[PDB]
Every structure is written in structure tokens, then in C-alpha cells.
Write an enzyme that holds these catalytic residues in place. Structure first.
Site, PDB file in Angstrom:
ATOM      1  N   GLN A 105       0.832  -1.223   0.000  1.00  0.00           N
ATOM      2  CA  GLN A 105       0.000   0.000   0.000  1.00  0.00           C
ATOM      3  C   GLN A 105       0.859   1.264   0.000  1.00  0.00           C
ATOM      4  O   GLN A 105       1.827   1.295   0.789  1.00  0.00           O
ATOM      5  CB  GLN A 105      -0.924  -0.015   1.223  1.00  0.00           C
ATOM      6  CG  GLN A 105      -1.752   1.249   1.258  1.00  0.00           C
ATOM      7  CD  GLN A 105      -2.863   1.097   2.267  1.00  0.00           C
ATOM      8  OE1 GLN A 105      -3.955   0.680   1.896  1.00  0.00           O
ATOM      9  NE2 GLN A 105      -2.618   1.390   3.541  1.00  0.00           N
ATOM     10  N   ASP A 136     -20.441  13.025  -9.025  1.00  0.00           N
ATOM     11  CA  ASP A 136     -19.436  13.080 -10.117  1.00  0.00           C
ATOM     12  C   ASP A 136     -19.853  12.202 -11.300  1.00  0.00           C
ATOM     13  O   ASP A 136     -21.046  12.014 -11.512  1.00  0.00           O
ATOM     14  CB  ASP A 136     -18.106  12.694  -9.420  1.00  0.00           C
ATOM     15  CG  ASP A 136     -16.853  13.363  -9.982  1.00  0.00           C
ATOM     16  OD1 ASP A 136     -16.054  13.963  -9.290  1.00  0.00           O
ATOM     17  OD2 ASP A 136     -16.590  13.238 -11.213  1.00  0.00           O
ATOM     18  N   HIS A 155     -12.938  10.214 -13.405  1.00  0.00           N
ATOM     19  CA  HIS A 155     -12.906  11.306 -12.421  1.00  0.00           C
ATOM     20  C   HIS A 155     -13.505  10.923 -11.086  1.00  0.00           C
ATOM     21  O   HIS A 155     -12.889  11.128 -10.013  1.00  0.00           O
ATOM     22  CB  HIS A 155     -13.585  12.634 -12.873  1.00  0.00           C
ATOM     23  CG  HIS A 155     -12.599  13.528 -13.533  1.00  0.00           C
ATOM     24  ND1 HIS A 155     -12.225  13.417 -14.852  1.00  0.00           N
ATOM     25  CD2 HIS A 155     -11.823  14.519 -12.983  1.00  0.00           C
ATOM     26  CE1 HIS A 155     -11.253  14.293 -15.128  1.00  0.00           C
ATOM     27  NE2 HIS A 155     -10.959  14.955 -13.995  1.00  0.00           N
ATOM     28  N   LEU A 164      -9.366   2.099   0.706  1.00  0.00           N
ATOM     29  CA  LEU A 164      -9.317   1.193   1.870  1.00  0.00           C
ATOM     30  C   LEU A 164      -7.897   1.079   2.438  1.00  0.00           C
ATOM     31  O   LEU A 164      -6.919   1.059   1.669  1.00  0.00           O
ATOM     32  CB  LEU A 164      -9.913  -0.136   1.379  1.00  0.00           C
ATOM     33  CG  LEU A 164     -11.362  -0.102   0.926  1.00  0.00           C
ATOM     34  CD1 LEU A 164     -11.751  -1.526   0.487  1.00  0.00           C
ATOM     35  CD2 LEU A 164     -12.218   0.330   2.121  1.00  0.00           C
ATOM     36  N   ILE A 170      -2.963  -3.098  -0.335  1.00  0.00           N
ATOM     37  CA  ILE A 170      -2.818  -2.761  -1.759  1.00  0.00           C
ATOM     38  C   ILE A 170      -3.133  -1.269  -2.001  1.00  0.00           C
ATOM     39  O   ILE A 170      -3.737  -0.619  -1.163  1.00  0.00           O
ATOM     40  CB  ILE A 170      -3.809  -3.655  -2.645  1.00  0.00           C
ATOM     41  CG1 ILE A 170      -5.282  -3.390  -2.268  1.00  0.00           C
ATOM     42  CG2 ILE A 170      -3.493  -5.172  -2.549  1.00  0.00           C
ATOM     43  CD1 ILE A 170      -6.347  -3.980  -3.215  1.00  0.00           C
ATOM     44  N   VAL A 214      -3.738   2.452  -2.626  1.00  0.00           N
ATOM     45  CA  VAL A 214      -3.489   3.724  -1.864  1.00  0.00           C
ATOM     46  C   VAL A 214      -4.239   3.755  -0.566  1.00  0.00           C
ATOM     47  O   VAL A 214      -4.642   2.734  -0.001  1.00  0.00           O
ATOM     48  CB  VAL A 214      -3.756   4.920  -2.814  1.00  0.00           C
ATOM     49  CG1 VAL A 214      -2.732   4.936  -3.967  1.00  0.00           C
ATOM     50  CG2 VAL A 214      -5.164   4.961  -3.349  1.00  0.00           C
ATOM     51  N   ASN A 252     -10.507  25.609 -12.017  1.00  0.00           N
ATOM     52  CA  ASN A 252      -9.161  25.469 -12.584  1.00  0.00           C
ATOM     53  C   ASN A 252      -8.718  26.508 -13.612  1.00  0.00           C
ATOM     54  O   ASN A 252      -7.720  26.218 -14.325  1.00  0.00           O
ATOM     55  CB  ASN A 252      -8.983  24.067 -13.208  1.00  0.00           C
ATOM     56  CG  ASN A 252      -9.257  23.035 -12.136  1.00  0.00           C
ATOM     57  OD1 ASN A 252      -9.110  23.170 -10.915  1.00  0.00           O
ATOM     58  ND2 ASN A 252      -9.624  21.884 -12.682  1.00  0.00           N
ATOM     59  N   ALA A 269     -19.275  26.456  -5.548  1.00  0.00           N
ATOM     60  CA  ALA A 269     -18.346  26.778  -4.449  1.00  0.00           C
ATOM     61  C   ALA A 269     -18.517  28.203  -3.916  1.00  0.00           C
ATOM     62  O   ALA A 269     -18.338  28.435  -2.729  1.00  0.00           O
ATOM     63  CB  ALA A 269     -16.907  26.521  -4.914  1.00  0.00           C
ATOM     64  N   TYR A 312     -21.225  30.032  -3.453  1.00  0.00           N
ATOM     65  CA  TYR A 312     -22.412  30.121  -2.568  1.00  0.00           C
ATOM     66  C   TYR A 312     -22.021  29.981  -1.109  1.00  0.00           C
ATOM     67  O   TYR A 312     -21.160  29.199  -0.656  1.00  0.00           O
ATOM     68  CB  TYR A 312     -23.472  29.048  -2.925  1.00  0.00           C
ATOM     69  CG  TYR A 312     -24.151  29.296  -4.251  1.00  0.00           C
ATOM     70  CD1 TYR A 312     -24.571  30.564  -4.631  1.00  0.00           C
ATOM     71  CD2 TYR A 312     -24.282  28.306  -5.198  1.00  0.00           C
ATOM     72  CE1 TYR A 312     -25.165  30.842  -5.868  1.00  0.00           C
ATOM     73  CE2 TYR A 312     -24.877  28.540  -6.434  1.00  0.00           C
ATOM     74  CZ  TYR A 312     -25.318  29.799  -6.783  1.00  0.00           C
ATOM     75  OH  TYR A 312     -25.896  29.981  -7.991  1.00  0.00           O
ATOM     76  N   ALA A 346     -21.877  26.450   0.560  1.00  0.00           N
ATOM     77  CA  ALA A 346     -20.908  25.522  -0.013  1.00  0.00           C
ATOM     78  C   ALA A 346     -19.542  25.853   0.629  1.00  0.00           C
ATOM     79  O   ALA A 346     -19.163  27.029   0.786  1.00  0.00           O
ATOM     80  CB  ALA A 346     -20.810  25.629  -1.525  1.00  0.00           C
ATOM     81  N   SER A 357     -10.445  19.672  -8.269  1.00  0.00           N
ATOM     82  CA  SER A 357     -11.249  18.456  -8.143  1.00  0.00           C
ATOM     83  C   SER A 357     -10.571  17.418  -7.239  1.00  0.00           C
ATOM     84  O   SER A 357     -11.265  16.661  -6.568  1.00  0.00           O
ATOM     85  CB  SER A 357     -11.448  17.890  -9.520  1.00  0.00           C
ATOM     86  OG  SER A 357     -12.356  18.574 -10.349  1.00  0.00           O
TER      87      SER A 357
END
Ligand SMILES: [Ca+2]
Ligand SMILES: [Ca+2]
Length: 269
Positions: free
Chosen positions: A2, A32, A62, A73, A77, A79, A153, A163, A165, A168, A215
Site C-alpha cells: 500500500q 461526479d 474522475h 481502503l 494494496i 493507496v 481550474n 463553491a 455560494y 458551499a 477536483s
């Protein structure tokens, strides 16, 4: 074997995991392109609001990537997510093309508030405001959902909707030097920043890929919110959002960074 992506270490997630905080019992909705079945993810449920893609599986990559930053997790293994025990829901609001209609995004939020989600991850945004979107953001918020969204971006001094608002929590991106990533939108309404350059995560086809963007920054904060929620089961969306900002590491101007770099170690103290 991992590995721990640099961003995960940057926000000090492992510090929290060592206190027993992993996001257990916190429901997090990823709005997404979907979430693909993957050995390093645990997908509890979800829904698709994309006509023509009834399935929650990801045809883009994405959504899968964003999901792994929140909750890959903790095992032998792949990440490791910021909140590896969080309950993940795949909410498909964007198609394979990576784009979606506003109405699908608003339906996804309605869904989040109707299904008792604690956190909604929206790694998407537009330069234009939307009455429909706004109302959805506000409805999910009064339903107890913490809405986390990417600042955009385009590298401009104004942030994207939703974002922007008030309800948010707007997230920008930093690089390995703790500087704002050139593409990261900033300005009024920016709450906080997180790693967003070279972020390695889960990807469709049972592999791993590295992406850049606001993102990628967003999920670090959605994950940090789940850690705080686990520690403080009685706190509201608002209390979590203020705590994250209150415990962020200052990086310089609030116009550029909001509160600073999210810090899961400091927030879970
Ligand atoms: Ca793993
Ligand atoms: Ca905001």
C-alpha cells in the site's frame, strides 16, 4: 504493498488514523461521473441522474479518482484515503464525457439530503450562477449535509459556482511547496485549500492514476470532514466547516488560500 499519496500525508490523515479516526459511520456522497468497482474501494450504494447511464459505474475516471482520495481502503494494496472507513455512495450527476446538466446535479443533492448523507463532494463547477443549483445547495444544507466544492481550474481571482455560494465549502489547490497551484481559482468565498497537483488515486480498470485539479483538492477536505464527524458525532455541517477552517494551517493571504491548508491532525485533536 500500500502506498500513501503525498497529499494524504500533507493533510496529516495518518495522525488521525492513529487516534482511531477513520470516518467510520460517516456517509459521504460523491456527486461526479460515477464510481467504478475497484479492489481498493467499498461502494455502499448510490443513484444515477444521468439519462442514458442508469448505472453508477464510472465511464470517465474522475469520480473513481475523487472517491479514492476520500476513502481508498486501508489494507495491503493500492493507496489510502483520508477517511478509509467512510461509507461511500456513488451519485452519478455527470456523464462519461465528464459533463452534466444542472438539473442532474440538483437531483443528486436532493438525493443526498433525502438519504441522510453527512458530506457531499462536488468536484465540479461553473463560472455562472444557477438559481436551481443554489436552491439544491441550500436544501441539502438544511438537511444536515456539508456541501464541499472545487473552486475551479481557470487560475482567476473569482471562484466557480456552487463553491461561491455561502452554504458551499469552497476548496482550492496547493502544490508540494505549499503554494497555490497556478490553475487554482481564488478570491471571495474561498474557504480552505488542500493538495491538488500530482494526486495519485484509484482509477477504473483496477489501476491507479495521477491527476491535477481543484477536483483533487476537494476530496481531501470531504475526507477531513468525515474524521471530525466521527470524533464529534453531535456536530452539525456548520460546526464541522468552522472547525476545519479554525484548525487549518495559514499559508499566506486569505484571498489566495482562505483559512489555509486543511489539517486533519489539528482538527481531530
Ligand atoms: Ca489500500
Ligand atoms: Ca463558499
Amino acid at each position: 504493498a500500500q502506498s500513501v499519496p503525498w497529499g494524504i500525508s500533507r493533510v496529516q490523515a495518518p495522525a488521525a488514523h492513529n487516534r482511531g479516526l477513520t470516518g467510520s459511520g460517516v456517509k459521504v456522497a460523491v456527486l461526479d461521473t460515477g464510481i467504478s468497482t475497484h479492489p481498493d474501494l467499498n461502494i455502499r450504494g448510490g443513484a444515477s441522474f444521468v439519462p442514458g447511464e442508469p448505472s453508477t459505474q464510472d465511464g470517465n475516471g474522475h469520480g473513481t479518482h475523487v472517491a479514492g482520495t476520500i476513502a481508498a481502503l486501508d489494507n495491503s494494496i493500492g493507496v489510502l484515503g483520508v477517511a478509509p472507513s467512510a461509507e461511500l455512495y456513488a451519485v452519478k450527476v455527470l456523464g462519461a464525457s465528464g459533463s452534466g446538466a444542472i438539473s442532474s446535479i440538483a437531483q443528486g443533492l436532493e438525493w443526498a439530503g433525502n438519504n441522510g448523507m453527512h458530506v457531499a463532494n462536488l468536484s465540479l463547477g461553473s463560472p455562472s450562477p444557477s438559481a436551481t443549483l443554489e436552491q439544491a445547495v441550500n436544501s441539502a444544507t438544511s438537511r444536515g449535509v456539508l456541501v464541499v466544492a472545487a473552486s475551479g481550474n481557470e487560475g482567476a481571482g473569482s471562484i466557480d459556482y456552487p463553491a461561491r455560494y455561502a452554504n458551499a465549502m469552497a476548496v482550492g489547490a496547493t502544490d508540494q511547496n505549499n503554494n497555490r497551484a497556478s490553475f487554482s481559482q481564488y478570491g471571495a468565498g474561498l474557504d480552505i485549500v488542500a493538495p491538488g497537483v500530482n494526486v495519485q488515486s484509484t482509477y477504473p480498470g483496477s489501476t491507479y492514476a495521477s491527476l491535477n485539479g481543484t477536483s483533487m483538492a476537494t476530496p481531501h477536505v470531504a475526507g477531513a470532514a468525515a474524521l471530525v464527524k466521527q470524533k464529534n458525532p453531535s456536530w452539525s455541517n456548520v460546526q464541522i466547516r468552522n472547525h476545519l477552517k479554525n484548525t487549518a494551517t495559514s499559508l499566506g493571504s486569505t484571498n489566495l488560500y482562505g483559512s489555509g491548508l486543511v489539517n486533519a491532525e489539528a482538527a481531530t485533536r
